[PDB]
Design a protein around this ligand. Structure first.
Ligand SMILES: [Mg+2]
Ligand SMILES: [Mg+2]
Ligand SMILES: [Mg+2]
Ligand SMILES: [Mg+2]
Ligand SMILES: [Mg+2]
Ligand SMILES: [Mg+2]
Ligand SMILES: [Mg+2]
Ligand SMILES: [Mg+2]
Ligand SMILES: [Mg+2]
Ligand SMILES: [Mg+2]
Ligand SMILES: [Mg+2]
Ligand SMILES: [Mg+2]
Ligand SMILES: [Mg+2]
Ligand SMILES: [Mg+2]
Ligand SMILES: [Mg+2]
Ligand SMILES: [Mg+2]
Ligand SMILES: [Mg+2]
Ligand SMILES: [Mg+2]
Lengths: 135, 85, 141
RNA sequence: CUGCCGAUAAGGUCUUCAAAA
RNA sequence: AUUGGGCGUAAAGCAAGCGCAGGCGGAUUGAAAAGUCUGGUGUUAAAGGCAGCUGCUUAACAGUUGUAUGCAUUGGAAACUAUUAAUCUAGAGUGUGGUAGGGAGUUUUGGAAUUUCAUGUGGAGCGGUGAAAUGCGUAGAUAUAUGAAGGAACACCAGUGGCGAAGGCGAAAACUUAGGCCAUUACUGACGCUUAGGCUUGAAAGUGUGGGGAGCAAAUAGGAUUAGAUACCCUAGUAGUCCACACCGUAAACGAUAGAUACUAGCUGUCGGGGCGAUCCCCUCGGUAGUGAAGUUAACACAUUAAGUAUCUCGCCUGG
């Protein structure tokens, strides 16, 4: 614009927002305050399992889940794989992501880590789904 | 190379050997056109017509169909491009 | 020398001359006139030394109260100028002051940079020779 | 020379390639 | 996007103006030296940074020497900016002399036309529509002739036009009043541009109080059309449209283009002042239009009244 104009009102940069906000909130519990500390992946507990329908092009039945994390945020996390052991009440170790078919889902469950079982009958790209090397 | 007899309404950039002259008079044009033809005929070794010549042999007539009128008129044949709505 | 038209000039003295030169070059005009000031007079003197303009004459009125400088551009036989592009650095408002270590080189020395350090306007090469810098008026190439 | 005159389920092909003759 | 972006049609020029503080700013002379440049000294801890070398089997790594950046003080330079002391008129104003306007407000005045009423003539429809029907009419309608009352708006002139910053301004007159164009051998002598905040004005609709109400018509009633019609058509019809005083402050308030300054081909119109003197036409200085090259643009297009070459200032934009 103008040197004088920018001297008065400087250039304010646009902000940046995260893609997995619920994974960066830590509740201390002794004081009950929420601070913003980034963490790659977080543990939660599921509340309601079921299926959802993709947006438009895709047509299928995708298994969702309403998991409450160690914090106090309830996030719908897709169970990435074919077959699950979730029983409405269970513990899961969510990670980052964003399934494009289901609107609102922005997290994935790390498979074969804690209570959730691995994905057997898989020999390709196993390191990601969590299956013991056939050997 | 292109030579031309510009007549005040020409872009001088396009022409190379500009020859300031008329273009509307059936006498000036013929005199100049024969002059370029006269150069060609002398180079080709045939006798000249108007160039390097005295008064009596340059004389030319004004075609049919006081002084000659080199006025540009007929402006009424330029109305506004059909528009309006 | 006599005139017929009123002579006006802009309030900002470097770009006024710069606009005159650039418009004349683009429009193929040769002789232009403007009001005369000592900063403007000095920059024109170094320009003719660098060979960008042909002549530069400063004139005064019959009363000694006004002076106007009327300069002409140096066109070649085929009518293409010697100036290619002009750009002003120390514009009004934001004045540019650069030390000697940061003295610019315009087009690897092809163009000339006008710098008025302490002894009036001065070319970039001679400014480098004296190892002294200062106000930078305009880029001419 | 001016009546009236409304609607039409979802997702979809088709350009493989100029290296060259 | 300081380096390094944009605001006509893609996001973005406030509706316009009067404008303090701020930013910028004509020419010349003198001084000082706050910015600006440069020399000397001090310091900017060590590790890290970059270059070289050594040592670990070479490397990673460790050590080693070199390597800036800024601040303060002191000594000089005087081109530009800033400060101060003064001079000049070309910027901008003032006066005299020419001069064009629907520029505004206040107070009066005028004629057609519609409606209603009064008085005659007259005798069956009028009205309305795509076609009709509500409706009006033997209580004499429509029509025709005269008169009276009242309100609203000002045909023709009227424009390939004028004025105002914008909204806007068009029957006639009086009073008050604003700005503008041209020529200046006159005068002041930079007093100028922009403007955050502030103030003023600001189409129509709407509000409050009191008047006014001819015509028209949101809301409403009825008749049509329609599958339905709370709409398009028709007949009625209140608020409102009008005036005075108080508010509201929004419009596609558009040239979708902020203001100021200097420069850049030309041609055709038209308006005003000035020069000549029948007009007509020629020249000069300005306002308002069309065409048009360099130039700009993504293209459409702009093009001396810029969206072109540049500077100053303000406002605004950052995917849906
Ligand atoms: Mg029908
Ligand atoms: Mg951009
Ligand atoms: Mg827009
Ligand atoms: Mg505007
Ligand atoms: Mg706007
Ligand atoms: Mg003003
Ligand atoms: Mg001020
Ligand atoms: Mg100056
Ligand atoms: Mg250190
Ligand atoms: Mg080390
Ligand atoms: Mg009457
Ligand atoms: Mg109103
Ligand atoms: Mg009804
Ligand atoms: Mg009616
Ligand atoms: Mg009302
Ligand atoms: Mg608005
Ligand atoms: Mg055009
Ligand atoms: Mg958003």
């Amino acid at each position: 614009a103008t040197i004088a104009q920018l001297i008065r009102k400087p250039r304010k940069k646009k902000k940046v927002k995260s893609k997995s906000p619920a994974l960066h909130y830590n509740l201390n519990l002794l004081n009950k305050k929420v601070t913003n500390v980034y963490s790659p992946l977080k543990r939660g507990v599921c509340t309601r399992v079921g299926t959802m329908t993709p947006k438009k092009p895709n047509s299928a039945l995708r298994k969702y889940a309403k998991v409450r994390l160690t914090n106090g945020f309830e996030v719908l996390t897709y169970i990435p794989g074919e077959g699950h052991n979730l029983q409405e009440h269970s513990v899961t170790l969510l990670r980052g992501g964003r399934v494009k078919d289901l609107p609102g889902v922005r997290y994935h469950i790390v498979r074969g880590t804690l209570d959730t079982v691995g994905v057997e009958k898989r020999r390709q790209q196993r390191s990601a789904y969590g299956a013991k090397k056939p050997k | 190379p292109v030579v031309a007899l510009c007549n005040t309404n020409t872009n001088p950039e396009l022409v190379d050997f500009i020859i300031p002259a008329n273009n509307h008079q059936p006498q000036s044009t013929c005199l100049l056109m024969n002059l370029l033809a006269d150069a060609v005929a002398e180079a080709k070794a045939m006798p000249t017509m108007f160039a390097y010549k005295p008064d009596e042999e340059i004389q030319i007539e004004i075609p049919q169909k006081k002084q000659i009128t080199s006025q540009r008129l007929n402006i009424t044949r330029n109305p506004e491009v059909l528009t309006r709505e | 020398i006599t005139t017929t038209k009123p002579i006006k000039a802009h309030f900002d003295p470097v770009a006024d001359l710069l606009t005159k030169i650039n418009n004349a070059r683009k429009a193929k005009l040769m002789t232009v006139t403007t009001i005369a000031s000592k900063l403007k007079i000095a920059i024109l003197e170094i320009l003719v030394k660098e060979g960008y303009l042909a002549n530069f004459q400063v004139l005064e009125n019959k009363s000694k109260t006004k002076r106007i400088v009327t300069f002409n551009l140096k066109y070649t036989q085929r009518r293409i100028p010697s100036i290619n592009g002009v750009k002003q650095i120390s514009k009004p408002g934001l004045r540019i002051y650069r030390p000697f270590e940061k003295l610019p080189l315009v087009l690897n020395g092809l163009g000339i940079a006008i710098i008025s350090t302490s002894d009036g306007v001065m070319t970039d090469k001679v400014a480098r020779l004296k190892k002294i810098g200062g106000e930078i008026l305009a880029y001419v190439w």
